[PDB]
Each structure stands twice: as structure tokens, then as C-alpha cells.
Enzyme design. Structure first.
Site, PDB file in Angstrom:
ATOM      1  N   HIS A 216      -0.828 -45.072 -44.947  1.00 20.33           N
ATOM      2  CA  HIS A 216       0.414 -45.175 -44.175  1.00 20.33           C
ATOM      3  C   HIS A 216       1.073 -46.520 -44.475  1.00 20.33           C
ATOM      4  O   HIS A 216       0.564 -47.318 -45.268  1.00 20.33           O
ATOM      5  CB  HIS A 216       0.228 -44.881 -42.660  1.00 20.33           C
TER       6      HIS A 216
ATOM      7  N   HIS B 151       1.640 -49.334 -42.794  1.00 20.02           N
ATOM      8  CA  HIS B 151       1.336 -50.613 -42.187  1.00 20.02           C
ATOM      9  C   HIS B 151       0.634 -51.558 -43.159  1.00 20.02           C
ATOM     10  O   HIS B 151       0.075 -51.160 -44.182  1.00 20.02           O
ATOM     11  CB  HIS B 151       0.444 -50.389 -40.953  1.00 20.02           C
TER      12      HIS B 151
ATOM     13  N   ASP C 237      -2.125 -53.203 -43.262  1.00 17.24           N
ATOM     14  CA  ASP C 237      -3.501 -53.090 -43.700  1.00 17.24           C
ATOM     15  C   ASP C 237      -3.712 -52.001 -44.740  1.00 17.24           C
ATOM     16  O   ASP C 237      -4.847 -51.836 -45.219  1.00 17.24           O
ATOM     17  CB  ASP C 237      -4.445 -52.893 -42.513  1.00 17.24           C
TER      18      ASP C 237
ATOM     19  N   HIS D 179      -1.608 -41.716 -35.465  1.00 14.27           N
ATOM     20  CA  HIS D 179      -1.491 -43.168 -35.419  1.00 14.27           C
ATOM     21  C   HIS D 179      -0.115 -43.616 -35.890  1.00 14.27           C
ATOM     22  O   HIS D 179       0.447 -44.589 -35.376  1.00 14.27           O
ATOM     23  CB  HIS D 179      -2.558 -43.757 -36.332  1.00 14.27           C
TER      24      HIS D 179
ATOM     25  N   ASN E 179      -3.133 -50.421 -31.974  1.00 15.52           N
ATOM     26  CA  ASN E 179      -1.679 -50.433 -31.933  1.00 15.52           C
ATOM     27  C   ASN E 179      -1.176 -48.998 -31.839  1.00 15.52           C
ATOM     28  O   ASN E 179      -1.582 -48.143 -32.630  1.00 15.52           O
ATOM     29  CB  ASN E 179      -1.101 -51.078 -33.197  1.00 15.52           C
TER      30      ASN E 179
HETATM   31  C1  LIG Z   1      -6.990 -51.286 -35.515  1.00 17.23           C
HETATM   32  C2  LIG Z   1      -5.669 -51.338 -35.499  1.00 17.23           C
HETATM   33  C3  LIG Z   1      -4.923 -52.548 -36.068  1.00 17.23           C
HETATM   34  C4  LIG Z   1      -4.660 -52.322 -37.556  1.00 17.23           C
HETATM   35  O1  LIG Z   1      -4.190 -50.977 -37.756  1.00 17.23           O
HETATM   36  B1  LIG Z   1      -2.833 -50.993 -38.151  1.00 17.23           B
HETATM   37  O2  LIG Z   1      -1.957 -50.465 -36.867  1.00 17.23           O
HETATM   38  O3  LIG Z   1      -2.382 -49.892 -39.343  1.00 17.23           O
HETATM   39  C5  LIG Z   1      -2.513 -52.488 -38.369  1.00 17.23           C
HETATM   40  C6  LIG Z   1      -1.356 -53.134 -38.834  1.00 17.23           C
HETATM   41  C7  LIG Z   1      -1.390 -54.500 -38.934  1.00 17.23           C
HETATM   42 CL1  LIG Z   1       0.034 -55.327 -39.492  1.00 17.23          CL
HETATM   43  C8  LIG Z   1      -2.463 -55.267 -38.579  1.00 17.23           C
HETATM   44  C9  LIG Z   1      -3.589 -54.626 -38.136  1.00 17.23           C
HETATM   45  C10 LIG Z   1      -3.581 -53.225 -38.039  1.00 17.23           C
HETATM   46  C11 LIG Z   1      -4.883 -50.160 -34.935  1.00 17.23           C
HETATM   47  O4  LIG Z   1      -3.644 -50.248 -34.717  1.00 17.23           O
HETATM   48  O5  LIG Z   1      -5.442 -49.063 -34.702  1.00 17.23           O
HETATM   49 ZN    ZN Z   2      -1.369 -48.603 -38.786  1.00 19.48          ZN
HETATM   50 ZN    ZN Z   3      -5.347 -50.066 -39.263  1.00 20.95          ZN
END
Ligand code: A1LZ4
Ligand code: ZN
Ligand code: ZN
Ligand code: A1LZ4
Ligand code: ZN
Ligand code: ZN
Lengths: 231, 231
Positions: free
Chosen positions: B83, B85, B87, B148, B179
Site C-alpha cells: 500500500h 504508506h 513503511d 487498513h 493507525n
Molecule cells: C503499525 C502501524 C504503523 C505503521 O503502519 B502504517 O499505517 O502503514 C505506517 C505508516 C507510517 Cl508513515 C509509519 C508507521 C506505520 C499501523 O498503522 O497499523
Molecule cells: Zn499503512
Molecule cells: Zn504498517
């Protein structure tokens, strides 16, 4: 200089000397699959020590006492917990078993009991109304009003101009609220204003979790809390 | 022996071999003052490797490429981001500079662009409707529906019965939601059901962050998401 969460393996405790007779203690804990650091304070009181907050659980708090013995070698004779949650009272039983007199406000003690958390023995008087302050050995305790929790206290060390905000103050790297189930979002910014008004001279501001900074941590926390309110 | 968040310094990457020609990669990163682990996948593709997701940022992703060269010694020729984001796409520029063909769905590419995140170069077609599946070398890519995030993909490795859920699937130790600002809470359990129904044979399930398990991770995630919905 200040130990960051990355550098502290869970189970061990670091001490960071801030001024003559003033240290913070830093521990880490796994929580929901992420590792968080947590701060408390140690303040020399004559040839004894005052502890502010546990090291978040029995294991860490036992290691805290052992690290104090190793690095400072003066007895911890009293401890204050700044609100009722487990990162602040978890470990009170370890402290009590080692002979430390443990203290919290009557509000903190009642809330800890309801939550099933460990309960400090002694009750701190004179902190029942927003804006109340009392001297406790080498620190001032201040109840700013409801914020992160309804019972939260902050601690000021006058000799070093050190303000420890507990979980009512967020570190700058924290951009989103932490746990707010027990918070008073409506009053939190006003309570922060009370801290600013009472300790405008503070030079070193310690959040509950993460890196210290200056008084701008107070406005930062207000900004994050107000953003969450409007979320 | 799966590495946990406490065992990995930020900036270092671990590989974990699941089966012949199948690994997860594990890294860690600080976010909002806590340290999180993060998983991706490596799947052997003849004498090349397919990468699923970056190691959360440019520094970690360069370390990931170094660790693959050291431990496996085969070239990564394509990568898929599950996706938009950071990470999952943070590090795509590192991959591209190394000659990796980076891929994501058009949905992921649009959202990354809007968010200011790195944008994988190639587009995965055939994944725009819930329930869509496409073969991609030694994996199947599946769009289960919004969860998510609206664009989240899961990845199945038929030769090893490995299902990589990315951030739509939570580890057991996570009992509260991550998140969800970009999530579709209403649809998330239905999307998980589509995963269950499409890959009922999966044996090894990998969440986006934390320890792998079985298909019980899908029920676990549903439990957590529904509990969050109700609070
Ligand atoms: C464990 C997480 C956090 C992790 O998962 B994520 O929402 O894809 C994301 C984005 C950024 Cl910028 C930093 C960390 C995360 C979650 O949102 O489920
Ligand atoms: Zn995410
Ligand atoms: Zn994540
Ligand atoms: C960073 C936090 C979390 C931390 O602060 B806290 O809300 O007092 C608490 C309680 C428990 Cl049991 C575990 C961890 C914490 C926050 O709520 O601001
Ligand atoms: Zn708290
Ligand atoms: Zn706290």
C-alpha cells in the site's frame, strides 16, 4: 546525549544526570507490539534519594533500584507516583518491599484501586484543587488540573529549574495523542496553562515518555491535544 | 527464532527463512516516539528475487539490499509495494537506483503521489475490484477490499503456503488498532473474510508488523478491528 528508546533494551534502566543531585531514570517496555521509553526522576534529599515514578512494572523497578545502588549508592527512602496508571504505579510493591515509603494523592490511590493497579501507601495532602502546590522534600508537587488523567501531578526541582511533566506532557516527536480514555481533553490545555504560569522559569522539561526539551513541550502538547479534540 | 522488535537496532535488517526460496525481512523504525518492527517478503524467482515491500525508509532499504546480497547473493529484480504508506514505499527510490523494477497498483500510486510518498514506477493491472487476484511471478497478488487502507494488497506464495497480510493483518500481541486514519473500518472485517475464503490453505501468515502465526491472525485482526469500531 539523552538515551533514546532505540538504545535501551527492555529490562534495563539508565540514569541520566541533569544537575547536581538530579537524575532522570529511563526504562523501556513492550506495549501492543511496539517499544516505548518512559521517564521518571531521582532527586537527592540530603544523603537520601526521592524517587518520582516507578520504572513501569515490577521487573524494571527492581532493576531501577539495583542501578541506583550501583551508580549512586544512596538509599531511596520515598517515592511519589504522578498518576494512577501502570507505568507510574507498576512497581510500587517492589519499592514497598525494599523499604521505600510510597506516596500518591488520595485521588490517585482511589483510581489505582478501581483499576486494579498497585496502590501507594501514603496519601499526599494539599493537592485537591487545580493550582495547588506543596513542597515534598527537595521538590514541589503541583496539581495543574485534569489533563492526561484527572489526578495527574507534575514535579518541579527548584535547585535545577527542572520540570517533570509526567504523561500530561508529550515529547516533540509525538504528533498524535497517546492513551486518552482517562483524559479530560476539554481541560487539558487549561491545565497546561497552569503549569506554564507556575513554572515559567523552567529550563529542562521532561515528558512522561521520550526526549526532554524546553517549555515549548507545553505548547506542543496543547497543539497535539487540540488537534485530537478536533479529530 | 523469529526476530522481535527488541532484538533489532534501527538501521539494521534481519532475514528470516520460512521455506525453500522464501524469506521475510524484518526492520525497525521509530514513529511517534515508539519503536516498531516491520515485515516484508523475499521470494526466489528462478535465479532472481522478488521483493515485497521496502524496509521502511531509505536507510533501512539500503541495509536490506546489503543483507540480501550477503545472505542470499541473488539480484532483486522486481519489488511490489502493498500500500501507499511510508513503511511500504519508503525506500522505493533506493530500489530504483539499484535497478529494481518497482511496482504498485494504480490506486497505490495515486495515493502515494497525493500523500507525498515515493511512487513505484510500474503499475499492477487487474487489482482494482475487491476479490481480484493476479499472478506475479512466484506469488499471487490479491486485493481483498478496503481495510487498513483502500489500496491494501496481500501476497500469497503457493509453493510455501505463506500468506503476507501486510498492514491489514495484526500480530497477536497487538490488541488495539494501529493507525486507522486511512482505514475503512466498516469494510475491514469483510475484506479479511475474502482473504480467508481465497487462501484457506495458508499455513504461515505474516502481519505487517510483528510475529507470524497462522490463519488465526485473521480472526485476531477481526476481533481487534471490531473492538475498535465499538470504542
Ligand atoms: C503499525 C502501524 C504503523 C505503521 O503502519 B502504517 O499505517 O502503514 C505506517 C505508516 C507510517 Cl508513515 C509509519 C508507521 C506505520 C499501523 O498503522 O497499523
Ligand atoms: Zn499503512
Ligand atoms: Zn504498517
Ligand atoms: C504514551 C502513553 C502510554 C503510557 O502512558 B500511560 O497512559 O500513563 C500508560 C499506561 C500504561 Cl498501562 C502503559 C503505557 C502508558 C500515553 O498514554 O500518553
Ligand atoms: Zn497514563
Ligand atoms: Zn505514560
Amino acid at each position: 546525549e539523552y538515551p533514546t528508546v532505540s538504545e535501551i533494551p527492555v529490562g534495563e534502566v539508565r540514569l541520566y544526570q541533569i544537575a547536581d543531585g538530579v537524575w532522570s531514570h529511563i526504562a523501556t517496555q513492550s506495549f501492543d507490539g511496539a517499544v516505548y521509553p518512559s521517564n521518571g526522576l531521582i532527586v537527592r534529599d540530603g544523603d537520601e534519594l526521592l524517587l518520582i515514578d516507578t520504572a513501569w512494572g515490577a521487573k524494571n523497578t527492581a532493576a531501577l533500584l539495583a542501578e541506583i545502588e550501583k551508580q549512586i549508592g544512596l538509599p531511596v527512602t520515598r517515592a511519589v507516583s504522578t498518576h494512577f496508571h501502570d507505568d507510574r504505579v507498576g512497581g510500587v510493591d517492589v519499592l514497598r518491599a525494599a523499604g521505600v515509603a510510597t506516596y500518591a494523592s488520595p485521588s490517585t490511590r482511589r483510581l489505582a484501586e478501581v483499576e486494579g493497579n498497585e496502590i501507594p501507601t501514603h496519601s499526599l495532602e494539599g493537592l485537591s484543587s487545580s493550582g495547588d502546590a506543596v513542597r515534598f522534600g527537595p521538590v514541589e508537587l503541583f496539581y495543574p488540573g485534569a489533563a492526561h488523567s484527572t489526578d495527574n501531578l507534575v514535579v518541579y526541582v527548584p535547585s535545577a529549574s527542572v520540570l517533570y511533566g509526567g504523561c500530561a506532557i508529550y515529547e516533540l516527536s509525538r504528533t498524535s495523542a497517546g492513551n486518552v480514555a482517562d483524559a479530560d481533553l476539554a481541560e487539558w490545555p487549561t491545565s497546561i496553562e497552569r503549569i506554564q504560569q507556575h513554572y515559567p522559569e523552567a529550563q529542562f522539561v521532561i515528558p512522561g515518555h521520550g526526549l526532554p526539551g524546553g517549555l515549548d513541550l507545553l505548547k506542543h502538547t496543547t497543539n497535539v491535544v487540540k488537534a485530537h479534540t478536533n479529530r
